[PDB]
């Protein structure tokens with residue numbers, strides 16, 4: 072008879088202290104990591120439910136364990152909302168993460184060794200888009216594609232590569248690209264060589280949901296996304312599709328299970344279901360608008376201050392700052408901004424002379440501060456403080472000054488009130 | 489963003505289903521070997537704000553900033569994991585058992601390498617070479633099962649190993665009730681220079697209490713989930729002892745960036761607190777009751793004329809072969825379910841039916857034991873089960889048994 076009153080605080084102080092500190096860090100820090108956000112207490116409530124106890128392999132109605140009557144309802148809710156929010160006729164809510172959702176798509180449509188056309192990591196592509204240190208690069212033959220000297224994808228060259236290499240699948244998506252991708256144009260290219268157009272919209276799923284970024288669902292054979300980025304939900308993966316055949320969806324369901332996973336996390340899926348409902352609110356649509364809007368405001372300031380912004384601008388929630396001409400490593404910038412309570416993340420840039428762990432740039436995202444209340448005014452001011460730090464990266468007095476400024480604004484905009 | 493936000497007043501549908509599951513867990517006798525009831529402390533962790541942090545990499549070498557406290561959290565889980573099992577290496581980031589196993593494969597083998605693993609119908613897990621799983625699709629699998637006696641024949645295993653010269657031998661199971669000789673498997677591996685990979689997901693809890701042979705000191709690499717007999721959150725875990733810096737390097741890379749992205753820091757916090765609870769003395773006597781209860785149910789089943797694979801049990805579970813009773817696991821499962829007794833259809837050795845239908849059921853005592861049941865209650869439960877199986881079409885029999893379960897269930901509430 073476990074007691075509902077059994078808590079962590081009085082049982083494990085070590086773990087407890089660390090947790091509480093993270094709770095405060097999230098309040099005293101300006102999070103500018105593009106892939107992060109602040110999920111609602113409703114999503115956390117779900118994740119902390121008793122649904123963590125149930126084993127439910129299979130799908131609603133076709134499980135491999137008994138007693139799945141209510142978890143079946145839960146999973147169905149997540150599936151239906153997912154389809155309605157994105158306009159798909161197929162959705163799989165069991166992938167444990169973005170990597171897992173992507174892994175499923177690979178194993179369901181390709182054979183080890185097949186050729187895949189994906190966006191290079193330094194140019195903005197994700198690890199699972201063909202990186203040699205990831206399963207994508209080890210199990211398949213990858214042909215990369217990057218961006219112009221203008222900072223955008225050259226669909227003319229992409230087409231050439233496609234025609235010359237005849238890839239079995241073309242991957243559209245990114246982790247660090249600030250432009251707008253022409254989904255329809257990539258589908259055209261895929262169709263000309265009979266390839267699959269697989270789009271990973273993890274980073275822009277939220278913006279797409281609000282209608283602030285082109286929806287790829289109606290142009291790709293298969294789409295994947297995480298639920299924890301701009302979508303602002305729990306950490307998890309999701310597979311979506313529209314206009315596919317019974318077979319394709321059967322393959323996709325098999326790829327997830329028993330293909331690459333065991334039992335799903337019913338408590339996390341409950342959270343996905345509630346987050347997908349929150350993404351349906353009108354306030355959610357104006358929220359994404361502020362996100363893109365704030366992103367543009369920070370870019371202006373960075374350019375006015377003499378900083379190189381890859382692609383010259385932004386059409387989404389993020390942007391890259393190339394620090395090569397400033398003789399700074401992303402690792403240095405990241406660490407300096409951190410001491411001022413401004414959290415970003417070192418990021419490789421196109422033609423980066425440094426390795427992924429060091430990099431010559433930093434990636435910035437507005438989803439967190441926007442969800443926190445910030446607007447153009449606050450964002451322009453924050454961008455400014457950032458450049459102040461970068462400008463005098465060795466001046467502890469400058470960093471000190473800024474630190475107090477952020478602690479001050481962080482207090483007026485509590486994350487969880 | 490207001491802390492007062494909750495599901496009840498915002499999403500009545502989701503809330504209603506959740507609440508029902510909450511009651512189902514109280515009104516049902518869960519006998520699914522892979523399930524349990526995690527403490528409210530583990531749930532508390534999983535519902536924390538740690539779900540907001542992205543922390544790729546390992547403590548000290550992350551790819552994002554602001555990982556000072558999540559680094560402390562992950563270290564706690566790693567240290568406790570090592571101390572509880574006696575390993576000098578532990579990886580707490582795998583999202584699940586499948587993911588932990590996938591890492592071990594990709595870190596030690598090349599697509600197409602030969603692997604010796606236990607056949608699924610004979611008790612092996614999907615990730616141990618099933619053709620419908622990545623293990624069976626990416627590697628060359630040679631299976632091995634059990635005797636006519638119900639146990640592994642280490643003599644035949646050795647023969648298979650010498651003849652096929654596999655690059656890795658897998659020890660572990662999802663539905664075997666015996667004791668595996670880890671040292672003996674390591675002997676066999678060594679003779680052909682193969683890797684001995686042991687997946688102890690099902691018996692991690694028993695091992696922790698010292699109730700089942702610990703494989704850590706005999707295998708090159710060990711994996712386990714944290715949500716079965718260990719009674720923690722749903723997740724994976726990699727353990728190793730006596731390996732080299734190279735091997736651990738590979739293992740860390742296999743998990744990330746090899747097969748995963750960011751870990752679930754909130755789940756890892758839960759792993760950390762569950763591994764501390766597994767250190768309690770009450771936890772050791774708990775596993776003892778589990779194994780003990782398992783034996784008590786087996787006796788009754790045999791006395792009632794039911795075929796129990798392997799003739800008995802040396803752990804938390806056992807299989808009931810229903811072929812001679814002309815019943816499918818799917819039928820038994822459904823019948824027992826209407827009596828509020830939840831089990832799961834399970835393939836048995838030489839099963840004439842497919843995995844979705846099966847000719848048997850698997851039974852586990854971890855849940856009811858953690859719930860308070862002891863030999864007396866377990867013998868009585870096993871009895872009711874046989875009553876249902878005996879008269880599987882008698883709705884009057886099933887109803888009477890449902891009244892009995894609801895009753896004993898009210899006397900042993902799960903969460904209070």
Ligand SMILES: Nc1nc2c(c(=O)[nH]1)N(C=O)[C@@H](CNc1ccc(C(=O)N[C@@H](CCC(=O)O)C(=O)O)cc1)CN2
Nearest residue numbers: 192193195196197198204246247418426427428551745
């Ligand atoms: N373009 C881009 N930016 C991104 C991501 C991405 O996938 N693509 N990430 C998405 O999450 C994060 C960065 N994650 C990375 C993780 C590992 C390696 C990597 O290549 N590691 C190699 C070599 C490292 C070294 O320099 O020593 C390795 O570990 O072997 C790179 C990026 C954030 N920024």
Ligand SMILES: Nc1nc2c(c(=O)[nH]1)N(C=O)[C@@H](CNc1ccc(C(=O)N[C@@H](CCC(=O)O)C(=O)O)cc1)CN2
Nearest residue numbers: 135329608609611612613614620662663834842843844
């Ligand atoms: N021995 C054993 N028992 C176990 C498991 C296991 O891995 N091994 N499981 C561990 O979690 C659960 C069963 N999970 C399974 C999931 C899928 C298939 C399977 O082979 N499905 C095929 C064919 C199904 C059919 O009969 O139609 C498929 O989907 O293609 C089998 C078992 C519980 N019992």
